[PDB]
Amino acid sequence: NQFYSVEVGDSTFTVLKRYQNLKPIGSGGIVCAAYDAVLDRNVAIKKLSRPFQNQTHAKRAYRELVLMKCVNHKNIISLLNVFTPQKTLEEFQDVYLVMELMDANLCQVIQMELDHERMSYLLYQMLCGIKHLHSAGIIHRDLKPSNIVVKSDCTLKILDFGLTRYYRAPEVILGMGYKENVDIWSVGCIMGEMVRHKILFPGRDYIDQWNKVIEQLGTPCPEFMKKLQPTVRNYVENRPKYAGLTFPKLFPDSLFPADSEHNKLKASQARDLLSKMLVIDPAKRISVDDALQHPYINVWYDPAEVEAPPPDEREHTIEEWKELIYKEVMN
Numbered sequence: 001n002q003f004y005s006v007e008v009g010d011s012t013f014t015v016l017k018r019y020q021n022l023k024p025i026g027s028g029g030i031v032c033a034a035y036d037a038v039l040d041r042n043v044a045i046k047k048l049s050r051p052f053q054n055q056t057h058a059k060r061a062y063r064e065l066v067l068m069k070c071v072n073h074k075n076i077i078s079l080l081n082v083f084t085p086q087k088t089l090e091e092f093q094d095v096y097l098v099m100e101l102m103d104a105n106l107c108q109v110i111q112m113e114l115d116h117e118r119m120s121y122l123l124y125q126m127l128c129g130i131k132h133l134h135s136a137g138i139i140h141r142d143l144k145p146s147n148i149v150v151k152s153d154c155t156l157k158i159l160d161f162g163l164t165r166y167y168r169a170p171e172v173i174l175g176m177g178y179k180e181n182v183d184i185w186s187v188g189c190i191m192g193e194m195v196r197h198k199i200l201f202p203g204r205d206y207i208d209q210w211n212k213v214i215e216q217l218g219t220p221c222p223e224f225m226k227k228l229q230p231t232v233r234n235y236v237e238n239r240p241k242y243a244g245l246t247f248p249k250l251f252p253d254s255l256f257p258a259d260s261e262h263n264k265l266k267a268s269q270a271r272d273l274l275s276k277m278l279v280i281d282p283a284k285r286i287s288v289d290d291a292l293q294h295p296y297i298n299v300w301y302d303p304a305e306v307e308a309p310p311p312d313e314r315e316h317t318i319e320e321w322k323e324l325i326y327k328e329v330m331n
């Protein structure tokens with residue numbers, strides 16, 4: 001047999017024999033660290049249990065499997081291998097996805113005191129990854145630190161393809177319609193969180209989250225309000241009003257290292273970029289291309305990374321999703 005089974009965490013992993021020394025990593029999906037004896041390197045193995053168990057799980061698993069094949073960029077997940085230990089469609093239960101083993105997820109990195117060298121390079125790569133997605137017509141809308149992983153040399157990869165809701169843009173929260181700079185918002189939320197070491201807009205639901213947005217950034221302009229459908233517009237127009245805080249007060253000097261002129265200047269640059277990404281109205285929020293030209297970011301700008309080439313959506317029953325997924329897994 002090509003497979004063996006082992007108990008990692010609370011789950012059973014049935015994997016190709018090439019993958020050895022399985023060890024659990026992180027929290028959440030169900031993922032393992034392993035040594036791959038064929039490639040002679042360390043990999044991560046994700047177990048999707050019964051991805052066809054409901055139409056929501058199924059649509060996501062299918063969509064992501066299909067896009068992981070599509071895409072080609074060093075800041076986006078690229079699969080090394082995909083397999084099921086089950087031999088037939090009737091027996092089909094689980095899918096295993098294999099990729100590079102990194103060193104940490106971005107939530108761990110955010111907890112570090114980071115210099116501007118590291119923070120700017122992390123943000124640079126997020127923007128390269130996001131630009132690549134958009135170039136293939138993929139607008140993420142749910143970018144968040146827990147789905148981003150990092151190596152020790154600060155190399156980063158985004159692991160999912162989008163649509164914890166703290167990183168979602170106003171247009172997502174309010175059902176507005178969006179363009180590509182919807183994902184800037186989330187990058188802006190991550191950046192702010194790297195500075196504050198606190199989640200910027202930690203709402204338990206969308207009402208609470210909107211409240212924390214307006215409390216800090218201020219009530220948006222009328223121009224913004226009339227882009228909202230009338231009933232959501234009613235809600236938003238009738239919230240308690242807020243003038244909002246300036247970005248120096250949102251992100252005080254105390255948050256930034258002040259030990260050199262380099263760092264003083266980089267602090268002012270970081271706050272400038274933040275003030276252009278955390279903008280409620282997407283008509284006035286910075287784009288991905290403009291952000292890549294910002295002085296905080298442009299020091300890293302490599303056209304081979306920024307301008308790399310990119311290579312329907314119905315509903316189905318779970319029976320139908322199982323077959324669709326089984327097919328993709330088998331090719």
Ligand SMILES: CN(C)CCCC(=O)Nc1cc(C(=O)O)cc(-c2n[nH]c3cc(Nc4ccccc4Cl)ccc23)c1
Pocket residue numbers: 025026027031044045046077097098099100101102103104105108149159160
């Ligand atoms: C001995 N020490 C020093 C070594 C430390 C090494 C170490 O801990 N590394 C490490 C830590 C953490 C973490 O989160 O804390 C996460 C990872 C990680 N690397 N690649 C992944 C892919 C997925 N998802 C995934 C996997 C496969 C396919 C598809 C997907 Cl989406 C999920 C998590 C990871 C690695």
